[PDB]
Every structure is written in structure tokens, then in C-alpha cells.
Amino acid sequence: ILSVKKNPSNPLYTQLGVLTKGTIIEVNVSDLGIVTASGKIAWGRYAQITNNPENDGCVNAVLLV
Amino acid sequence: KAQNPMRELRIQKLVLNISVGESGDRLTRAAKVLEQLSGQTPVYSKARYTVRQFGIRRNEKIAVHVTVRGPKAEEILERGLKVKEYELRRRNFSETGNFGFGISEHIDLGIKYDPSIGIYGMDFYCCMTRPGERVAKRRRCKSRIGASHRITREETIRWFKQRFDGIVR
Amino acid sequence: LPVTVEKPTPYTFDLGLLLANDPNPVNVPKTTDTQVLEQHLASVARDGAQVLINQLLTTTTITATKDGVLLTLPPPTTPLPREKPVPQPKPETKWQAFARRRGIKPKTREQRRNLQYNPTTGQWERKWGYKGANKRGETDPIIEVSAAKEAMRPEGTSVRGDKRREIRARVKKNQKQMLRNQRIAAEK
Amino acid sequence: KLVKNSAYYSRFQTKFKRRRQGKTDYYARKRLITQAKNKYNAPKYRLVVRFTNRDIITQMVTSEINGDKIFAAAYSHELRAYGINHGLTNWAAAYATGLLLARRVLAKLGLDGEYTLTEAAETEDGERRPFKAILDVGLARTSTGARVFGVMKGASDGGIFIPHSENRFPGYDIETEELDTEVLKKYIYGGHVAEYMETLADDDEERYKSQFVKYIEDDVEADSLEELYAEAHKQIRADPFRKYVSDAPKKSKEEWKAESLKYKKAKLSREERKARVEAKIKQLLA
Amino acid sequence: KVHAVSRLAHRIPGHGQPILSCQFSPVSSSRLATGSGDNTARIWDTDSGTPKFTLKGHTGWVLGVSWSPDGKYLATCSMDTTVRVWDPESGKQVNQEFRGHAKWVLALAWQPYHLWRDGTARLASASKD
Amino acid sequence: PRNARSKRALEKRAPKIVENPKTCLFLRGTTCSQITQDAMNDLYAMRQVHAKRFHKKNAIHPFEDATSLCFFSEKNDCSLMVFGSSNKKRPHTLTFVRMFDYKVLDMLEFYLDPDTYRSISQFKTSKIPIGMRPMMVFAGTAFESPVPNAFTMAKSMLIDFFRGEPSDKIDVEGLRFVVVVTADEPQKPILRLRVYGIRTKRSGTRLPRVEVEEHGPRMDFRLGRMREPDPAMLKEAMKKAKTPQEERTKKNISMDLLGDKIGRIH
RNA sequence: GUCCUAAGGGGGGCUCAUGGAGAACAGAAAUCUCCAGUAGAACAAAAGGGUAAAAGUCCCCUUGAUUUUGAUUUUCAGUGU
RNA sequence: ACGUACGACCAUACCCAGUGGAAAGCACGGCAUCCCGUCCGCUCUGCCCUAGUUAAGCCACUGAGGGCCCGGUUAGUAGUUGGGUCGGUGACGACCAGCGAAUCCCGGGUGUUGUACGU
């Protein structure tokens, strides 16, 4: 995880970095091997949390592509 | 040098104008009757300035016109001067060599009367050019037509008399 | 032919401006013949161009890119006058002074966005501007009006322009404050 | 009142001479030659494409302070050396002329003792760079299917790096944003002209003879155009500087000087002008 | 000396499925052969960036294209257990398809030109069987 | 500023930390000789991209009143000016004017020698491309005066004229033209302006052998009247601003080769 | 009191105010045609030289209403991603 | 020398009219299947270079009326700064210098030029 971009409930929750459902986070996509049109290596992208980490013990996210 | 084939007078275009002055169903009828007369869609003209006396407003469609080129222009001008009985005035011809007239009833041309569209009159204007008119119209190297190549009032009157067998009074 | 020249005083260089300075005197011949005069001047020019080319090709790093073979130049060192004065901080306005005294922090760029979520319609809408929420109801087909405000309303005016009236009043107050701040800054 | 008076004539400011002649768009020229994304002080080349009634003119041009310079020039009437004798202004001839100019540029540069500072400062990890030029279409309209882009396509195929997109080539579809390379190949090898030949041969034989009267006279069928243009491309890539002699009268430069000065009307001298003025004064007195 | 390629020459469409094999002609770079998952092979004129021929007849993905060492034949092996030989100057299939494999034919290899005997060429096909 | 275009113009004319390349305005007086006009044409040809040109006659004597010059600098955003004049006392004069904050910073007069002047068209060589910067060579002992004089002022003014656009990189193919200004200390010394094109030859070593060929123009000047800057305005003009990309050095704080901020303890 | 897929940006095409000669109603003033028209129109500013295949005017595309990153500049930070 | 294409100075090149143009090139031109665009294949775009024609464009020469551009003259003169240097109470006059006009008048002119390919 690189950063927490937007918690949908509160900017205070975004500032505290709370990982809940629907949260937009920044992730390191170096392992995915994404190359841009100019040949640069895209190593940071946005994902959305699709689960409840407080209930599951794990953070599940889907890349916003 | 006047016997050169490139100086031959011919019709450049024929413009048919209906200045209704009021927007709406009347203007649509004028556009429709222009459409059957020409065979192509007409152009709506908007008023430049507003005049309270004429009851017009700026940027309001008040007139309609069609530009026709080729032998279609020749046959429409033949129809118009058939209505005018091949008789024109010296008052009509311009100093630049163009001419024109106006009719009051479009039924006299040969269009069957339809009471849905009504009765309209029209202004016919014919422009006359010699070959070589591309010089002042093309995008690249646009220039001015020379003085000897320009068409005079006497030349276009003589052309009309010789071609339509008409009379100018 | 040699590619190095020897002179009593060495050249100085400013490779940012591609400038070569020769402090050695130009011993111009004291004759009137143009061919030998320009020959001497061309010899001086050739010497300067030679040392400049040598300096550029030896003491600048070279990169071969798809654009070509580029020399990386140092920033210019020759002291030259500016055309305009160095930018300075603006005079502090009344709001800026008040916020500095009261510890009022600037709003974040996410906080000051022109976007909000309308719950009742369930859509995203703008707070101001074209179709903004500050003009809510001006195109609403049905508006209930209170009888007291309708009676106190002047003749000819409608309820559909009240929000535009309020917006115009607020804009006029804001522009009056802006003009006062501009006049005070101009006096300063 | 007279609008063209002395005050109007004194206050009038003329445009540029080539703007009055209607040959140069200086607004586009300024951005073509005096604008650069990078400031590496490098020379810039443009491929100037111009069209006449009977010829195509392609040039490789740099801009200097006292006038432009031509690096190489190719003309569509030089295709007669490579076998193209008809349709010297069609899209395929535009393609072949652009290809010929590209091959001539590469042959002149040797990309097919004085030396350059690039060779002086070349490093170990350095590769050969392509020749680069920007297209100059002049006052022509840049629509889909124009022959300026055929010239550009031929030059890019010949080996000049010209920045371009593919949305103005014949066969491009704007609704799908996809180029039909079948239609592109048809236009490159002149299949549109050939298809017009069979269309006229089936519909209007008199129009077919009137438009293609040279084609039947030279006995060039519609089905041979693709082979003819392919063989022309191969000959262009083989020998870019093949000499072509025209059927025009041939004299030396001094003989042409004499022939033109034979028909030049000399300007009258001051003595002759004063004599004519005195004769006019005498005629006015009489 | 071979200089490094640095820019796109031509992007040529025409295949409806991903391209699974590509190979230049041994004569020159003007002719290129590709085989794809749309059950077809294609020849490309790389000078003008244009298609030349479309070889059709396989019913599986063309897993391999291979030019003959002299350049007079193009052999294509496909997922339909078949190998076909085509004439690259006309785009026509030479005789019938080669049958006998039980599963997908994955690779092809021509006999070297100096080893050809009995007035014929020899082709080796490796399959999943 | 209502329109975004006028807003862009005001933002372009606004003072900046990194200044724009300077613009030169070429203009002439009520009377001006043909040789002076040819010299102005040659200088404008050398500086086409960052110049603007007037074409009327201006009733301006710059060393008496320069309010009109300040107004022209204000209107055209031109910080350098070349002013042409002719006279009985001064037959061919080029007045170089340098501005600061739309006010006259300093001025210098050049008297052109008419008999030795040669234009660019009189040399049948390949010319400089439009927009390409030439390199500069200043030769002689007149430019090393310990006190600021007319020759140091002329050196600074010609450097500012032939700067072009600054750049951190340059292609090796952009080193083909050189402008040489020669002047010696001493009856009046002659400041000679020449332009040459540069050819390179093999010499058997790594460095090439440079040979020159004259490009034009050929100018000979005598330095005339001089208006020096006010010391306070000169100090404000010679102040140097620092870009945000120039890090202020902090004690015991550094950047490593990976970009980490590193502190040092002792 | 009304109206607007907002302004802006890019690209392309065109030339304006006016005058003369002409065209049923149409007559100083409606619309259309030609010729002449250095801008005398429009848009900005307050030129003592703004803009004419445009900076004017109509089409096409975007309209996403204030992007991301920064060890760098300035200020701030008891909520220092 | 002439023509064409890109140009450089941007009226000595502009506004109006007449006369002529070998060669080739430009140009007017012919036709609307395909590419493309219009109310109108007028413009733009595609195809033909065959046929007609120098009528216009273009070029050269000439002609008026304006305009424009050089050089001299005005003239080192008006005017403006300096008690500068001499008087004048001072103002101001002359003298000494420094900067420095324009009108009028006279004479000349109505385009030079680079690259490339051709005649």
C-alpha cells in the first residue's frame, strides 16, 4: 500500500488512513509490469477496497483500470 | 482579340430570393416552393439589424434563397423570361454586367397550385462571367480580373437580345 | 595542422553563453590594405573558434540521444542585467492579515472543490456556477411561497429571481472588499 | 466622396509581396520555422509539397536569414525515367515522387578532409539517427485522401522520419478510428484510377477514350498499373539519380540568354523619355 | 553493420486474432509472413506497409510459419493437426495439406538447402502426439 | 483583464524568477541614412526571432528625452532597442538602449564607418539559419578595464544582443557560426564586428581543425556618447534570483544517491 | 423579467463597417447579386505603429467545474500517510 | 536573360489603364467513379494534360494622376540647455559653447536579391 487516497465517509478518516470498504488507496504495481505509452514504468496506481478488513483480517482491493 | 473563344459570355449563377420578412410557416412554405422549383434545399437568411417599423428582429430568419448553376439555371431563367414575355428594361441591367427581375406569382412558371403552400413571388438574379473567373475565386494565387475581361451593360444586353430573342426597353 | 594555439595570456570561457574572451591584444597592422587586414582579423577569429571548439569538446559531458549528440552546458556566469525586477511578495490583504492573526488555516484543494453529493436526488452537483446549488429551485416547476413574503414582495418582481438577487448582493460586497484591498495595496 | 484619395494612398500599408501574390501563409510559416520544442540549436528541415496542373513539386528545405535553401528536389515529371508516363499528378505519382525525394536525400547523405562535429564527438554508445523533416502543405486543404499525404507516405516509406498520424490517408474510417490498408494499397498502386478505367469502359466508352486517350495510345491497360508502379518503386530504390532528358528544345545557358534577350523589350533611356515628352508637348501645342 | 531500430515503420492491421508467429523472407526484408489464431497466415509487403496475400484453409490456430531456405515455399503448421505449403509469390497452396499427425503440430523445420536430394525438399514437423 | 488571452498577455509580461528572452525593438528617427538602415537590417536578420520592427519616423533624440522610448518599451515589452539616426555631426549612428522596468537603464552610441561597411548580401556564402544562436568571441585589451567604461558597456550590450535563448544543452551541429568583436585600448579605438562561418577538417587527432569563412556583416564602430545607469537601479537590475529548483543548503542535511534525506552526527 | 451540452483550449474555412450599380411586394431603413473597400466593423485595451487566409466571425473535437509526483521555494502544522 | 517552387528586404514592389509575350513552364481548362466538401463539384477534393486559348492571371514595356523611396538644400538655422562669461538690481540682451528641427526648394527613381530545377 502506498497511501490512502479517499475514505468515502470522512476526510478525517482519510487523514487517519482508515482501510474500510469502498476506500480508494494507492498501491505499488511494480510486480504487475505495467508500461505506459511513452515507455515509462507505472509503479503506482489506484485500487478500491472491496471487502471489510475489520471483519476479514485482510485487505482486498480491485485495481481501477 | 474579341473573337477569342475564352471571352464567351455565359451564366455564372442564378439566385432565387424570397424575402418574406416574417419567420414561421410562411417562411417554411417559401423554402418548400423554392425546394420544388430548384431541386435542392434552400438557405434561410437572418436579419442583420432590428427595425421596429418593418417588424423584424436581428438574428431572426426572414428570407430564403437558392443558388443554382449549370443548365438548370438556364432553364429556370428561360421559364422566368417566358413569364416575363422576353421583355426587360434597361433599368434592370447593372454596370457590372449582371441582371435580374422579379415575378409576383410562382404559379405562372408552371407549378400546380397547392393551397397548403400558398402564393409567393420571387426575385431572379443572373450573374454573367467569361471563362477565367477561377482567378478571383481560387484560394491560392487569388487575383483581380482584368479590365478588358469584365462584362459591360451593353455587352450583356446584346447577349440577352441575341440569345433569348428578347427586347430591352 | 595544429588544433591548439599558444598565447601569452590564456583565454577565459563562459560555455553557458558560448562565449570566449581573449585578453591578448589584437595587433592590427597599421596599413590600409583590406585583404591583409581581414586576414589578420580572420586569424584572430579562427584562433578563438578553435579554442572554443576545443573547450566545448573536452570539458563538457556528451550524451548521444535520438535527437543527436548533445553537450551539457553549465549555467551562464557572465553578470548581465535583468529586464524586470525580482518578484516580491504581494502586500498582505485584510483577510490574509486576519487569518494570520487568528490562526486560520487555508482550505485544502479537496475541501474547496466545486462538487457535492445531493442526497435527495442522489446525484453529484456543483455548489456554485452554472446549474449550481446556490441557485436551487429557479428552474423548479413548483415553488411554494409564503403569504407574508408575497405581500411584502414589490410588484413586478417574482420569487424566481430572489436567489440571483442574493448572489448579486454577495458578489457586490466581495468586489467592494477586493477593490478596497487593491486600493490599499496600490497606496502601499 | 472619393475613398481612394491622397490620404488613403499615404496611409495604406501593403502586405508582404508573397501574401499579395497569394503564395505564402506567413502565419503558418512562422510557426513552421521559428518554433521548437527543444532548444538544442539544431537545424530543421521541411518537406515542401506543391501541386500544379501538370506536375508535383517536392523539396527538402532549410530556412536561412537571406532566403530558403534546397537540400534536394524531386519532380513528378522525372518519373518518365522510371517508366511512369501518364497520370503525373495522381496520388500514386505523388507517392512515387515522395519516395524518389526520400531516396535522393538518403543517397546525398550517404545513408542508403572535412567532417562533422557529430563525427568529432561521437561516443561508443552511439547509433545512426534518422533524417527528420516536417511536412509543409502550403495553402492546400488537409483532408482525407489528399495527395500531400501521399507524398508524405512515400517519403516515410523511403526512409525520412516525418511525424504524422494515419487519419488522413485514403481508406481511413472516422467512426471506427481504423485505417483500411486494402484501400491504402489500392491507392498506392493506383487501383482507383484503374477501377475508374473499367468503370468508364463499361459505362461511357466515349468518355473513356476522351479521358484516357493517351493510355490507349501508349497501350497501358488498367490491370498493368500495379506492376508498373511496383517496378517504378523498385527502380527508384535501385537508382535514385537516374538522368532523364525531356522532349523540350535543348540549348546551352548562354544560348538561352541570347534567345530571351532577343525578345526582351529594353527600358527607354532618359534621353528617349525626354524626347517623347518634348514630342508630346509639341503635339499638345499643335 | 546493422544499425539499431529506433522507431515504428508500419503498424499493419488485418488479423482478427493474436499473432502467434512471424518471420521474414530469407531473400530480403520486403516480404514478411505471420500466422495467427484466426486460422490464417498472411504475407506483408514491408516496404509500403501493406498486405500482399492471405493464406486460408487451416481450421485451427496457425502455430508456426517457416520459409524455405531458398525462399520458394512457406510452410504453416496449425492446431488442426495439419501442415500446408504455400507459394509466396502467388499466395496459392501447393498440392494438398499434409495429414498424419494426431494432435497439434507445434514446430516446423526445413531441411538445409545443400542437403536436398531426389529432386525434392524435406520438412520436419513436431507435434503433441 | 477580462479575456483569458489578455490574462495570458499580462502573465507573460509579469516579472518572473526565470526571465523570458529579451526582445529588441528596431526603430529610426526622422532622418536616417541608407547605410544605417542597412546596418539595422543586418542586425535584425541576426536577431529575427526576438525582435519587433517599427517602420515610421520618430521625432526622438534619445540623449535629450527618452520618455517616448520608455513608452515604446512599455507598449511592446521590448527591453533592448536599436535606434537609427543621421546628422551632420553624426552621419551614421546606432544607439543601443537597454531598459529596466520599462525605464532607461543605460544607453550607448555607435558611429558606423560608411566606407568599410559590408552587408550580409555582399558575401556569397551559406548564411546562418533563422533562430540559431552563434557563439561569441571578444578579443582585445579594451574589454578588461578595471573601471566600467564604454567598451565594457559595449561588450555587455553585444552579449545581451547575441545571447538568444539560454539552454542547458546544445547539439554539436549548432556550433557553425561565430560573432567576433575586436577592440584594443589606446586616436579613438575601433570596435570591429565580424561574423564567420565555421568549417571543420581532419587533423590526425581527436579534436577537429577549425577554419573560418566570412559570413557578414562587416561593421566598424567608434564608441560615442554614454549614459550610465543609476547605482540603485543598477543594483536592482544586477540582483540575481534563485529558482525553486536550487536547494538551500542546510547544515548536516544532505541527499543521498537514492534520494533519501541523510543527517550527519558528530 | 427571460435563455443557454458553461466558459476556456486547439484546428479549419471565411472577411468586416460603408459606398455605387441592380432585383415583385421592398418604398431613406427587410433580403439577395456584383464591384470598390487598411480595417474607418467587431474583439481587447487606453499607441506616439493591437489584431485581416486573424487576436474578428462561423463549423468540428474536448468540455474531465480545477489532475498526479517532488528528497526543491515560502508559510504553517498537538489530526507530522 | 526567361519560367517555376520555396523565400529575403516588405509600395522604388501600391491604386488605374493600354500594348506585347519565341521556347518551355505556369495558368485558364475538361470530367465528378473513387478520397473529400458544399444551397450550388462556385470554393475545397479526386481524375485527365488529350483538345482549345494567350481572353484573363503572370511577366515586360508605356502612360497620366496620386502615393512611396533616396541625396542635397534648409542649416548647424530656428529652438532648447548651460550668468556658461560679460553687462544688466534682477528679468533679459549679446557672446561663447553643447545638443539639435521641420516647412519650402532642387535633382533622381518606380524594384533589387538567395537556393534548386528547368527553357
Look at residue C21 and give its three-state secondary structure. strand
| Rounded CA separation D30/F49 (Å) | 9
Q: Is residue D12 part of a domain?
A: no
| Rounded CA separation F182/F192 (Å) | 5
By C-alpha distance, which of D61, D71, D55, D78 is closest to D24? D61
Q: What's the DSSP call for residue D114?
A: B
Look at residue D105 and give its three-state secondary structure. helix
By C-alpha distance, which of E101, E61, E95 is closest to E79? E61
In chain E the first and final C-alpha atoms are separated, in Å, by 43
Q: What's the DSSP call for residue D171?
A: T
CA of B151 to C1' of G25 (A): 30
| Rounded CA separation F32/B137 (Å) | 43
C64 interface with D at CB cutoff 8 Å: yes
C76 phi and psi angles, rounded to 5 deg: -65, 145
D162 interface with E at CB cutoff 8 Å: no
Q: Residue D276 contacts by C-beta under 8 Å, 6 or more apart in sequence?
A: D268
The three-state DSSP-derived secondary structure of chain F is CCCHHHHHHHHHHCCCCCCCCCCEEEEEECCCCHHHHHHHHHHHHHCCCCEEEEEEEECCCCCCCCHHHHHHHHHHCCCEEEEEECCCCCCCEEEEEEEECCEEEEEEEEEECCCCCECHHHCCCCCCECCCCCEEEEECCCCCCCCCCHHHHHHHHHHHHCCCCCCCEEEHHHCCEEEEEECCCCCCCEEEEEEEEEEEECCCCCCCEEEEEECCCEEEEEEEEEECCCHHHHHHHHCCCCCCCCCCCCCCEEECCCCCEEECCC
C70 interface with D at CB cutoff 8 Å: yes
By C-alpha distance, which of C50, C74, C49, C47 is closest to C60? C74
Task: List C-alpha distances in Å: F261 to A1, C82, F26, F252, F256.
Answer: 22, 35, 52, 10, 7
CB contact under 8 A, F135 and C20: yes
Q: Is B97 left (phi over 0), alpha (psi -120 to 50) or beta?
A: left
By C-alpha distance, which of D200, D170, D196, D195 is closest to D185? D170
Query: C-alpha cell of C154?
Result: 414589490
Look at residue B120 and give its three-state secondary structure. coil
| Rounded CA separation D65/F46 (Å) | 8
By C-alpha distance, which of C8, C7, C67 is closest to C43? C7
Give residue D59's identity as a one-letter amino acid code: Q
D261 interface with C at CB cutoff 8 Å: no
By C-alpha distance, which of F195, F78, F75 is closest to F134? F195
CA angle E48, E53, E58 (to 5 degrees): 140
Report the gap between the CA of B2 and the closest CA in chain D (Å): 25
Q: What's the DSSP call for residue E59?
A: S
Answer whether F18's CB lies under 8 Å from F165's CB: no
By C-alpha distance, which of E41, E37, E118 is closest to E73? E41
By C-alpha distance, which of C117, C171, C157, C161 is closest to C135? C161
Q: How many CB atoms lie within 10 A of CB E109?
A: 13
Radius of gyration of chain A (CA): 13
| Rounded CA separation D10/E48 (Å) | 58
By C-alpha distance, which of E39, E116, E45, E121 is closest to E85? E121
D212 phi and psi angles, rounded to 5 deg: -110, 35
By C-alpha distance, which of B64, B66, B65 is closest to B27? B64
Q: B11: part of which helix (H) or strand (E)?
A: strand B10-18
In chain A the first and final C-alpha atoms are separated, in Å, by 17
Q: What's the DSSP call for residue D241?
A: T
Residue numbers in D near C1 (CB within 8 A): none
Burial class, B48, CB count within 10 angstroms (exposed 0-12 / middle 13-18 / buried 19+): exposed
| Rounded CA separation D163/D178 (Å) | 19
Q: Which residue has the cell 522520419?
A: D161
Given strand E74-78, what is the order of strands in its sheet? E62-67, E74-78, E83-87, E92-93
- Tell me the angle at which helices D181-188 and D91-109 cross, rounded to the nearest 10 degrees: 80
Q: Which residue is nearest to nucleotide G11 (CA to C1')?
A: D142
CA of F106 to C1' of H101 (A): 25
Report the gap between the CA of E74 and the closest CA in chain D (Å): 23
By C-alpha distance, which of D111, D167, D121, D118 is closest to D144? D167
Query: C-alpha cell of E26?
Result: 530469407
Sign of CA dihedral D226, D227, D229, D230: positive
| Rounded CA separation A51/A62 (Å) | 10
Chain CA centroid to CA C129, Å: 27
CB contact under 8 A, F166 and C26: no
CB contact under 8 A, F172 and D69: no
- B:106-145 residues touching chain D, CB 8 A cutoff: 139-143
CATH of residue D256's domain is 3.30.420.100
CB contact under 8 A, D129 and C70: no
This PDB structure is determined at a resolution in Å of: 2.6
Chain discontinuities in chain E, listed by preceding residue (C to N exceeding 2.5 Å) = none
Q: B61: part of which helix (H) or strand (E)?
A: strand B61-68
| Rounded CA separation D50/D44 (Å) | 19
Q: Nearest nucleotide by C1' from B67 CA?
A: H40
Answer whether F122's CB lies under 8 Å from F195's CB: no
Answer whether F163's CB lies under 8 Å from F22's CB: yes
CA angle E27, E32, E33 (to 5 degrees): 115
DSSP percent split of chain A into helix, strand, coil, nearest 5: 15, 35, 50
Q: Residue E120 contacts by C-beta under 8 Å, 6 or more apart in sequence?
A: none
> Is the C-beta of residue D58 closer than 7 Å to nucleic acid chain H?
no
Answer whether E80's CB lies under 8 Å from E59's CB: yes
Question: Is beta strand F190-201 parallel, antiparallel or unpaired with respect to F209-214?
Answer: antiparallel
Concatenate the DSSP letters of all residues of B140-155 into one string: TT--PPPTTTSPPHHH
Query: C-alpha cell of E11?
Result: 503498424
CB contact under 8 A, F167 and D39: yes
C58 interface with D at CB cutoff 8 Å: no
Strand H bases with any atom < 7 A from protein Cβ: 1-2, 4-11, 13-31, 33-37, 39-40, 42-50, 52-64, 66-68, 70-71, 75-76, 99-102, 108-119
Q: Which of D161, D185, D237 sits opposite E50 (nearest CB)?
A: D185
> Is the C-beta of residue D120 closer than 7 Å to nucleic acid chain H?
no
Look at residue B49 and give its three-state secondary structure. coil
| Rounded CA separation F141/D250 (Å) | 61
By C-alpha distance, which of C177, D234, F201 is closest to E28? D234
- D:120-149 residues touching chain C, CB 8 A cutoff: 120-123, 125-127, 129
Question: Is beta strand B10-18 parallel, antiparallel or unpaired with respect to B61-68?
Answer: antiparallel
Q: Which residue is nearest to nucleotide H113 (CA to C1')?
A: F121
Question: Which ranges in chain C belong to alpha helices (H)?
Answer: 34-58, 94-102, 147-152, 162-187
Query: C-alpha cell of D138?
Result: 502550403
| Rounded CA separation F204/F209 (Å) | 9
Buried b (16+ CB within 10 A) or exposed e, F106-143: bbbbbbbbeeebbbbeebeeebbbbbbbbbbbbbbbbb
Q: Please give the tally of structural domains in chain D.
A: 1
Q: Is E24 left (phi over 0), alpha (psi -120 to 50) or beta?
A: beta
Answer whether B137's CB lies under 8 Å from B131's CB: no
| Rounded CA separation D45/D69 (Å) | 10
Give residue D81's identity as a one-letter amino acid code: A
Q: Which of C82, C90, C182 to mutate to test the interface with F (most CBs of F within 10 A)?
A: C82
Give residue B21's identity as a one-letter amino acid code: G
C68 interface with D at CB cutoff 8 Å: yes
| Rounded CA separation D283/F164 (Å) | 65
F214 phi and psi angles, rounded to 5 deg: -70, 135
F217 preceded by a cis bond (ω within 30 of 0): yes
CB contact under 8 A, D120 and F48: no
Answer whether F211's CB lies under 8 Å from F243's CB: no
| Rounded CA separation D33/D133 (Å) | 11
Question: Which ranges in chain E belong to alpha helices (H)?
Answer: none
Query: C-alpha cell of C134?
Result: 446556490
Experimental method: cryo-EM
Concatenate the DSSP letters of all residues of D122-140 into one string: --TT--PPPPB-EEE-TT-
Interface present between F and C (3 or more CB pairs within 8 Å): yes
Look at residue E86 and give its three-state secondary structure. strand
Chain CA centroid to CA F116, Å: 23
**Cross-strand partners of F29:** F58
Task: Count Cα atoms within 13 angstroms, Cβ side, for D239.
Answer: 11
Q: Is residue D5 part of a domain?
A: no
Q: How many CB atoms lie within 10 A of CB C4?
A: 10
By C-alpha distance, which of F118, F173, F130 is closest to D67? F130
C36 interface with D at CB cutoff 8 Å: no
Task: Count Cα atoms within 13 angstroms, Cβ side, for D39.
Answer: 12
**Cross-strand partners of E40:** E56
Report the gap between the CA of D44 and the closest CA in chain F (Å): 9
F204 interface with D at CB cutoff 8 Å: no
Answer whether B140's CB lies under 8 Å from D22's CB: yes
Q: Nearest nucleotide by C1' from B17 CA?
A: G32
Burial class, A7, CB count within 10 angstroms (exposed 0-12 / middle 13-18 / buried 19+): buried
Radius of gyration of chain C (CA): 36
Q: Which of C57, C64, C71 sits opposite D126 (nearest CB)?
A: C64
Task: Count Cα atoms within 13 angstroms, Cβ side, for F79.
Answer: 21
Cite the beta strand spans of chain A per DSSP E.
3-6, 24-28, 34-35, 41-42, 44-49, 61-63
Q: Is F247 left (phi over 0), alpha (psi -120 to 50) or beta?
A: beta
B167 phi and psi angles, rounded to 5 deg: -125, 135
Interface present between C and D (3 or more CB pairs within 8 Å): yes
Q: Nearest nucleotide by C1' from F109 CA?
A: H99
Residues E93/E99/E104/E108 CA torsion (nearest 10 deg): -60
| Rounded CA separation C69/C57 (Å) | 11
| Rounded CA separation C23/E129 (Å) | 87
Question: Which ranges in chain D belong to alpha helices (H)?
Answer: 6-11, 17-20, 26-33, 91-109, 117-120, 147-158, 181-188, 191-203, 205-211, 213-218, 225-238, 253-263, 270-285
CA angle F256, F261, F263 (to 5 degrees): 95
Report the gap between the CA of B132 and the closest CA in chain D (Å): 15
F22 interface with C at CB cutoff 8 Å: yes
Q: Is residue D6 part of a domain?
A: no
CB contact under 8 A, F139 and C48: yes
| Rounded CA separation D132/F210 (Å) | 27
Q: A16: part of which helix (H) or strand (E)?
A: helix A11-16
Give residue E64's identity as a one-letter amino acid code: G
Answer whether E5's CB lies under 8 Å from E47's CB: no
Look at residue C177 and give its three-state secondary structure. helix
Given strand A24-28, what is the order of strands in its sheet? A3-6, A24-28, A44-49, A61-63
CA angle F184, F187, F192 (to 5 degrees): 40
